[PDB]
């Protein structure tokens, strides 16, 4: 156990992201398009897979 607030603060940077389906890039959670050129700024995004 870390602490509940400290787990929230660490998960803000480590777990509450989104993943581009084409190029696996770690993206902002409210993003609409990937920031990478190689996937062509696609809008195929998924949430980052949580535990539990």
């Amino acid at each position: 156990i870390i602490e509940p607030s400290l787990k929230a603060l660490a998960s803000k940077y480590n777990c509450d992201k989104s993943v581009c389906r084409k190029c696996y890039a770690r993206l902002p959670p409210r993003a609409t398009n990937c920031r990478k050129r190689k996937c062509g700024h696609t809008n195929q995004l998924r949430p980052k897979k949580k535990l539990k």
């Binding site: 156990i1 870390i2 603060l9 660490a10 998960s11 940077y13 480590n14 777990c15 535990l51």
Partner: protein, 191 residues
């Protein structure tokens, strides 16, 4: 679509003085002074009444009028950073191995050293950019405060200290150990 005139404003408080020759900005306030080269962005400045300065671009494209609001935000950040200052509070996060952070001096350069992050024998040293003061805060457990005038220098030093504690070859959703910035604000917040 070639917007022929777009224009932003910056408010100058009573304590500061701003000097703009060609595109070099100098802001002088109570906490000190800051400077900025802006010869890459191609705008024009105009003082109105010694507490208002308009910045304008004529016949600009979409990217150019985006850069206008960007440079307004940069010079306004400089003004509020020399008036109120900038303070970033970061917290230490560990599961088992406590992170031991001190300040050392190789050749008088004010290094921040990080020991025992996930129990390793490696010592992580991050340098300190000039103008940034670091205090290990009392009365809150495991909290470090970086203060200064330049938001760029303070936030970059905080980001370097955050990025130096990354976990390799482990599931980072479970191994949440590190040093993360929890608060961003001013030194004289709620002035």
């Amino acid at each position: 679509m070639k917007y022929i005139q777009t224009e932003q404003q910056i408010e100058v408080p009573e304590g500061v003085t701003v000097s703009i020759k060609s595109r070099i900005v100098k802001v002088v306030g109570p906490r000190g002074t800051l400077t900025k080269n802006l010869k890459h962005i191609d705008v024009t400045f105009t003082k109105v009444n010694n507490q208002l300065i308009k910045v304008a671009v004529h016949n600009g494209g979409r990217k150019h009028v985006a850069a206008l609001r960007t440079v307004k935000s940069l010079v306004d950040n400089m003004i509020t950073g020399v008036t109120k200052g900038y303070k970033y509070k970061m917290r230490y996060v560990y599961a088992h191995f406590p992170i031991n952070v001190n300040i050392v001096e190789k050749d008088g350069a004010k290094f921040i050293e990080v020991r025992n992050f996930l129990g390793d024998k490696k010592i992580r040293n991050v340098p300190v950019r000039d103008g940034v003061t670091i205090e290990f805060s009392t009365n809150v457990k495991d909290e470090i405060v970086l203060s200064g005038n330049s938001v760029e220098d303070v936030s970059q030093n905080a980001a370097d200290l955050q990025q130096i504690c990354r976990v390799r070859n482990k599931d980072i959703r479970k191994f949440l150990d590190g040093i993360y910035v929890s608060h961003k604000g001013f030194i004289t917040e709620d002035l």
